[PDB]
Design a protein around this motif. Structure first.
Motif, short mmCIF file in Angstrom:
data_model
loop_
_atom_site.label_atom_id
_atom_site.label_comp_id
_atom_site.label_asym_id
_atom_site.label_seq_id
_atom_site.Cartn_x
_atom_site.Cartn_y
_atom_site.Cartn_z
N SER A 25 0.76 -1.40 -0.10
CA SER A 25 -0.03 -0.01 0.12
C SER A 25 0.81 1.24 0.06
CB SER A 25 -0.74 -0.05 1.12
OG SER A 25 -0.04 0.36 2.44
N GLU A 26 0.23 2.30 -0.51
CA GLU A 26 1.13 3.72 -0.50
C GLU A 26 -0.05 4.67 0.25
OE1 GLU A 26 1.35 3.19 -4.66
OE2 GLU A 26 3.57 3.82 -4.75
N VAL A 27 0.59 5.45 0.85
CA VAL A 27 -0.01 6.52 1.85
C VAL A 27 0.14 7.88 1.45
CG1 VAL A 27 -0.83 7.03 4.06
CG2 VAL A 27 0.03 4.74 3.64
N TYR A 28 -0.95 8.65 1.21
CA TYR A 28 -0.80 10.06 0.97
C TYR A 28 -1.54 10.93 2.04
CZ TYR A 28 -0.05 7.91 -3.51
OH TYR A 28 0.53 6.95 -4.52
N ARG A 29 -1.02 12.23 2.39
CA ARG A 29 -1.77 13.19 3.04
C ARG A 29 -2.50 13.71 1.92
NH1 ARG A 29 2.05 16.18 4.29
NH2 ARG A 29 1.88 17.95 3.25
N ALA A 30 -3.79 13.87 2.39
CA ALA A 30 -4.80 14.81 1.61
C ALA A 30 -5.81 15.40 2.27
CB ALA A 30 -5.74 13.54 0.72
N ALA A 31 -6.56 16.39 1.72
CA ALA A 31 -7.90 17.19 2.14
C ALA A 31 -8.81 16.80 1.76
CB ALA A 31 -7.31 18.65 2.18
#
Ligand code: NI
Length: 258
Positions: A25-31
């Protein structure tokens, strides 16, 4: 793509990805664009690494996780399939974790004071009691998975394991008592800055069946704290206490060390 307001947190179009913060899995900061709330967006390739059965299990599990609701447990806002991937939307815990805290103490070459240990441990117990009350097992309790916000709030994180319980070593079922084992190892680790059984599974098994771990120092840690550790890491799951008893001890000790 374009905003879909009816869809809440359940579609990628309602988020703006800000940064990749993790991978493997890949993890992003998002709004979330509807309300400006920051989130961790995890993308899992469940069609490139998962069997039809494992996929249903993983999904049923996430559905149980989404029902959880507690200040000390990372919130699962949503999960959905899109672009042939599983997307899990999580409360963002960005400021650090227990693993980092322990490193600070190791670097300053000092132990964590008992009152400080209870200050965080009791919050962790609150999280885990919520989970067990909802009949959900955590399965991955470890310092790096216990986030700490900037204001010192504990957030128990999302679900070669860091703490290997005896029943897991021998491939028995993971159950609620296995969470208690990890919780006990974690308490020990806060007090000693090292896992109790810090190798291979055979020598690990030997040490566990013989409580071959170094005692915590009695001049720094109370009988209460030391006994609580001792019972949580009993080899026999039937000998370990339920989370409710651990929590009650944590609350009493927190109240009188502060
Ligand atoms: Ni064995």
């Amino acid at each position: 793509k374009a905003l879909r307001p009816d869809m809440g947190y359940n579609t990628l179009a309602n988020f703006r990805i800000e940064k990749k913060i993790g991978r493997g899995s890949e993890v992003y900061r998002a709004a979330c664009l509807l309300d400006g709330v920051p989130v961790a967006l995890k993308k899992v390739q469940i069609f490139d690494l998962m069997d039809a059965k494992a996929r249903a299990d993983c999904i049923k599990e996430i559905d149980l996780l989404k029902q959880l609701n507690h200040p000390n447990v990372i919130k699962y806002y949503a999960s959905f399939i899109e672009d042939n991937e599983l997307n899990i939307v999580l409360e963002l815990a960005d400021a650090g974790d227990l693993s980092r805290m322990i490193k600070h103490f190791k670097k300053q070459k000092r132990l964590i004071p008992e009152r400080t240990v209870w200050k965080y441990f009791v919050q962790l117990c609150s999280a885990l009691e919520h989970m067990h009350s909802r009949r959900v097992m955590h399965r991955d309790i470890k310092p790096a998975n216990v986030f700490i916000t900037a204001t010192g709030v504990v957030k128990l994180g999302d679900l070669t394991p860091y703490y290997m319980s005896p029943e897991r070593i021998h491939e028995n079922g993971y159950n609620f008592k296995s969470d208690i084992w990890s919780l006990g190892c974690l308490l020990y680790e806060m007090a000693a800055l090292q896992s109790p059984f810090y190798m291979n599974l055979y020598s690990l098994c030997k040490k566990i069946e013989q409580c071959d771990y170094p005692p915590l120092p009695s001049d720094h840690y109370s009988e209460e704290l030391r006994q609580l550790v001792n019972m949580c890491i009993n080899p026999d799951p039937e000998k370990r206490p339920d989370v409710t008893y651990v929590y009650d001890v944590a609350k009493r000790m927190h109240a009188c060390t502060a």
